[PDB]
Design a protein around this ligand. Sequence first.
Ligand SMILES: Nc1ncnc2c1ncn2[C@@H]1O[C@H](COP(=O)(O)OP(=O)(O)O)[C@@H](O)[C@H]1O
Ligand SMILES: Nc1ncnc2c1ncn2[C@@H]1O[C@H](COP(=O)(O)OP(=O)(O)O)[C@@H](O)[C@H]1O
Ligand SMILES: Nc1ncnc2c1ncn2[C@@H]1O[C@H](COP(=O)(O)OP(=O)(O)O)[C@@H](O)[C@H]1O
Ligand SMILES: [Mg+2]
Ligand SMILES: [Mg+2]
Ligand SMILES: [Mg+2]
Ligand SMILES: [Mg+2]
Ligand SMILES: [Mg+2]
Lengths: 430, 433, 223, 434
Amino acid sequence: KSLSLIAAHSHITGLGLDENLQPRPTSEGMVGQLQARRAAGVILKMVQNGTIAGRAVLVAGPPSTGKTALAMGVSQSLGKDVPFTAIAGSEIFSLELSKTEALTQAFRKSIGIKIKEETELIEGEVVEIQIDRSITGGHKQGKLTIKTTDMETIYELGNKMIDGLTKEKVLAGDVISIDKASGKITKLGRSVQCPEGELQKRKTVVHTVSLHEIDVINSRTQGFLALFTGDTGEIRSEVRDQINTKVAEWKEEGKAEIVPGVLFIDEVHMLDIECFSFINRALEDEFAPIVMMATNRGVSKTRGTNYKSPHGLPLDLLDRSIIITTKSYNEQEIKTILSIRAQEEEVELSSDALDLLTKTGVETSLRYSSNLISVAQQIAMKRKNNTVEVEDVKRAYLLFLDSARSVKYVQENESQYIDDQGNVQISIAK
Amino acid sequence: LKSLSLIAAHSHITGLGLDENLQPRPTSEGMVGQLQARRAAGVILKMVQNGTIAGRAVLVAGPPSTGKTALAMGVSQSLGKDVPFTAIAGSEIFSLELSKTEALTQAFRKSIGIKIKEETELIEGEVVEIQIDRSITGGHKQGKLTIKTTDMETIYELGNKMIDGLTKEKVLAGDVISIDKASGKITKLGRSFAFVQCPEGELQKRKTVVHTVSLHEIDVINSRTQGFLALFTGDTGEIRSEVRDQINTKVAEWKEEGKAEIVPGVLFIDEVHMLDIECFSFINRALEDEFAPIVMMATNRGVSKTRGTNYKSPHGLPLDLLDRSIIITTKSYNEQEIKTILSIRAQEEEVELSSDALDLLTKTGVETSLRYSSNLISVAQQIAMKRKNNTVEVEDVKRAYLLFLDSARSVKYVQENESQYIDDQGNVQISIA
Amino acid sequence: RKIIDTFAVLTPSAVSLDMRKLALGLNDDSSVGENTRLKVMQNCFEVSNPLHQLQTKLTIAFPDKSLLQYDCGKLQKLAILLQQLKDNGHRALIFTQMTKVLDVLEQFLNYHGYLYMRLDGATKIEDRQILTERFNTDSRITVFILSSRSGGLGINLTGADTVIFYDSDWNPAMDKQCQDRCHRIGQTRDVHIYRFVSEHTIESNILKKANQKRQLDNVVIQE
Amino acid sequence: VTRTAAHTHIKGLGLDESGVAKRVEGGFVGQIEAREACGVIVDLIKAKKMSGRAILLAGGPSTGKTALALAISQELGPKVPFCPLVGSELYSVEVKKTETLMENFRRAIGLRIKETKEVYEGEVTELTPEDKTISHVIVGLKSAKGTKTLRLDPTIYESIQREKVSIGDVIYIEANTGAVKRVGRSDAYATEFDLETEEYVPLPKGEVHKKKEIVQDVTLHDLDVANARPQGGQDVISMMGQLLKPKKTEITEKLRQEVNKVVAKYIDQGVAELIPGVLFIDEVNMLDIEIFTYLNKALESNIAPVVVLASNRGMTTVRGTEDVISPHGVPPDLIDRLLIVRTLPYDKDEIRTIIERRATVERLQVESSALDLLATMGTETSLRYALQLLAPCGILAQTSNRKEIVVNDVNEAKLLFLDAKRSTKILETSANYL
Ligand SMILES: Nc1ncnc2c1ncn2[C@@H]1O[C@H](COP(=O)(O)OP(=O)(O)O)[C@@H](O)[C@H]1O
Ligand SMILES: Nc1ncnc2c1ncn2[C@@H]1O[C@H](COP(=O)(O)OP(=O)(O)O)[C@@H](O)[C@H]1O
Ligand SMILES: Nc1ncnc2c1ncn2[C@@H]1O[C@H](COP(=O)(O)OP(=O)(O)O)[C@@H](O)[C@H]1O
Ligand SMILES: [Mg+2]
Ligand SMILES: [Mg+2]
Ligand SMILES: [Mg+2]
Ligand SMILES: [Mg+2]
Ligand SMILES: [Mg+2]
């Protein structure tokens, strides 16, 4: 019950690799890209190993290849209890927060800490409640009886037990479960309840907390209000250094174990050079998570400089990083992807509509066909049949136009559209 | 009465000065000339006085010394009371604490007002005597006083808050009060014999009170409690649009129920040429809203480069703004109209001028500019005043001409003395040899 | 206070309770001590603020006394014609069917501040003739409220010149008697009888089905 | 009476049940493909399943893009939330444009809830501690049909002390919220004093405890602001909680995860129902490259609904870029996930029906000679100049006491008011920059 409507990235559940790391053709929503899924499986067992750190990887390629879908498959095959941070490249630009300290905030958000402890719990059915107070003095004196299948005893209560017992309404028929260390009462069921087992049991509780939370909490008291309201930023590095030595001492004492998480940055091409050199230093730190980058642009001019650097990134970033590239798909793989999108969207398609939709998916793009499969079931639905016909795909093709077709229409109608200098012919004659 | 009025450049213009058939007179209500501009401005005047249409923008253009700002001043003066008029600058929307778009939305909410009326009761009458009753230890005051007029004289018993306001505010038997029942506050207006008071009429009367409040005030008030302190201190800005949407449906429900009637006001923006393109596209959307006032613009610059872009767009505005707007243009004046304008400025400034000083002042007003002659008429009465006569002579106008130099004459003096003045590269000859 | 009381309408319809206690750090469990929240809540408990009118006006939307006539379509033009008959120096009668509009009409007539006397089945026999002779003689009472079955059948009111009907169920003989209580022998002025019919309602279909059928008798209203 | 400002003549798209659009229907003449395709977008919002779909409307001026935007906004209805927005409005200096853009993506969606609340009212009899104390107050509310005593918190008792109530005052107390409103002194104490500032209200009819259910709708962004910052209260700690930090900040993703976590718990209980909405962005060519690149990842996000764009340019330079030339001012990666609906222009007779139907909505009477003259001005100057000159001809008809628009009135409108090309032709001849 993670909230799941129909996404572009909803059908991809897991990387879908074997024990020998050779990818299947059709497995777990991912079809094609054998080398990218195998190398992404090497990254997956790199996170699952956890013995190494401070490594950056890059996933590049043309559009309609699924590098963000590959990182989504890595995050979905990562499982629970491991933190995954997915931020944007333009998300670090802020006015109240500096870009470098926000990038440090993401680098502290990526890695978490597991801390466990043991607590006692007494769960059992209440027979009757007999409190005792005074009309003038006070000093309440509580007594009630706790019962289970093989134990039935009377428990005398203190002041705070009657404080929590009178601030929260409870009956004889109502059944409680009391923690001794926490002091709060769990009024679970009344005579749901149908209990078994022993009366007093001790179980272990495990809490997962990232290093960024400890950073803003140990910054100041109102850093918790800044943890919820988001008004944090520019923490002093003495909290980071003493927190690093405290975390290393917790690892040496065996109290707290940490989980190496993955940091994913989307659209890393338009990043500042200060953040580039800051990554060039921060990749060599001790507590440095595995960084996956998705450079989406081409060769152009980097923001902050005048020269056109190749890849949109300086070579100091690309020297200490590994690069995975993706290739284009065949004609059959577009039909397979539209078939598994028909299985994800719960859309029954015909063979000829899948062939024509595959042809217009090869000709124009993947995304236009991946939306024409959605609207084709609704042009079919207006005819009150669940079967999708070729007439719905042809109507959806003549109605929803491609980008290149309206590029031809714009170049044919340049007098209608406004030019660069603001000139526009809003009339017809003269 | 008693709007603060010294001698302004725009003080003599009082009203548009048009007839019932909208044909303008030659000399009427301070405005002389510009027949087509005053007639079209009268069409805008009856457009605001009609109020059945909205969401329209107009533009008044022309060369300098034509009075497009004076034409909009004549529209605002002929508009009368109870209609809101907002006159802002083009560079006024640029702020650091406030965004330019939300400040422009704030002006668009400032332009339109709402009239809401209600009825209250009032008891006004002369006091005969006051007899309160309290206790030295307990409290619980018990007030009694007598209220008298010409045809009624009765004793009124008072409550706790009547003695609270009656002892907070000092009053006597001779002093006369006028009490509102709903408000609960006392108006100690006059006193009897040694004040003003000399009252007539009935004792208890009910009259209606009408309050006028713009939509921007309701926007910042319904934003938060300290939006009233931001309404006085001016520390407002960037209001959430749920207040604007629910306030629009609440105002439309008040129009449907007949409770609140609104007045379509006029929005005037001065120096609209140096405006950002974001405000241009924001006007291009905001002109099509339902509650959109009539907008009058005064583009003052020429054809140049718009701020925010690199290309030189014509008129200093994009064509998306000028497509949905009407444009009124003004022309230059004749030689006689400058003498008529200087004559009515002599009537406004209370300056008695001679015929030859008006002829020479008209000639130097044709040659140089309107404004230089419109200030030489002011200083000529004072060069005349140093000779202790109220009559203005031609010697005062010639002395005021040789003393106060024109811009083109000192342009010739600057071009003759370029070694004296500092150049573009900072070079300056501060020596002689 | 009047502009605040009249112009503050909107409410923050979405809120989270017990967030006000946590935002300052004073709750049942926090990093602060035990009498920090007590001494802070006491110094807060003594210090007052002048913004409580805007606070109470912004927390809950106040349904003030003005919405009695604005939630009714019949009460929109009723006060306008009462002002028109007030400025022309005329008196009016009001005949209703049920007693639940009588108290609402008493609160409306007390809101607009006229002089009225109500006669219905909840009154006594002693005040009925005195309330009749008070309206029949020359006085300042403009509107006299009656009912259909109790006081609109056999009285001799000659003072009023206007009959106002809110609703009429049966009108071949029964509603004619109510307007015939006004028109009597002792009236020298013409009787102007009004009728309140809504738009696109059942009462809009009653007179439209009765105008075509020449108003004999109604059986079933269906449209 | 009725205000008409370049709108209110369109009551929707006006499509048939088969799908074929009529020529003259619902304030529209011509434009079959954009209206029928726009109705396909209307059904696409009525699907309540689709997300991430972006359809831009590209065309020239006076072609009907914003009118089609009011046609889809009117065709959806009041139950579907519509968020009008301009791309020039997304620039902010308090927070980034990213927070306003993703925040607007949280503004498009709606979510209707149903909940019951308890209503208490009555005349105050006693305000006294219980019997011994920590200072709480039993408030005995005397209603008409019942008399009950209730124990309250010290905060709502503090607001009771704020309202200056006493023995015999009618109050209004809400159980779940804790707000206190005073109605006034009861009618039994009206004869105690002859004049009093406190108005006298009657006793409230009915019981003491009342319950009702509301079908109130509230947007998910309103729940996000309710989860972000304290709004108001009647106590000192709540009002100072507002007064301390009222400046709006950026919202983290985990907060939205808890908001839609408990919202998903409310939809698991069957209480609420999630319905998507529409974010309509005006003048997309005015956006920066950062908002475009965050729109690339934002359209790949889940909760981003059907967003309709409107761009009126072509192969121009993107704002924030120097050498990038792309169609519509949109980068080609965002244009690849975009859908273009081409807008068709109008002929002379269609301009005549625009001026005709706009004249009937404007309630003005136009003669046939002035209708043909306004048709020639519609085919000579612009459409907006003829629609702009519909009103001054009626104004000159009002000053000339005529009920119909004549030839001399529209020719007088040609003399008093000038179009674009006459203004440029006049400004071509300049003595000193005319
Ligand atoms: N290997 C794959 N398996 C399934 N779907 C894919 C794959 N590669 C690409 N896609 C499709 O591509 C679309 C998104 O492409 P995207 O990852 O945005 O490309 P880019 O990252 O280059 O912009 C998704 O709708 C997805 O269905
Ligand atoms: N029709 C007129 N009647 C009287 N004075 C006028 C008229 N037109 C312009 N003026 C004069 O012009 C001056 C205002 O000029 P202004 O409109 O500020 O110039 P610009 O148009 O360059 O801003 C005023 O001093 C006013 O006396
Ligand atoms: N097909 C049409 N039928 C009727 N009126 C139209 C039509 N197309 C455009 N209009 C009118 O043109 C006016 C301006 O068009 P607009 O939507 O502002 O164009 P754009 O979206 O290009 O700015 C609108 O007020 C609208 O009433
Ligand atoms: Mg990508
Ligand atoms: Mg280095
Ligand atoms: Mg000017
Ligand atoms: Mg009889
Ligand atoms: Mg538009």
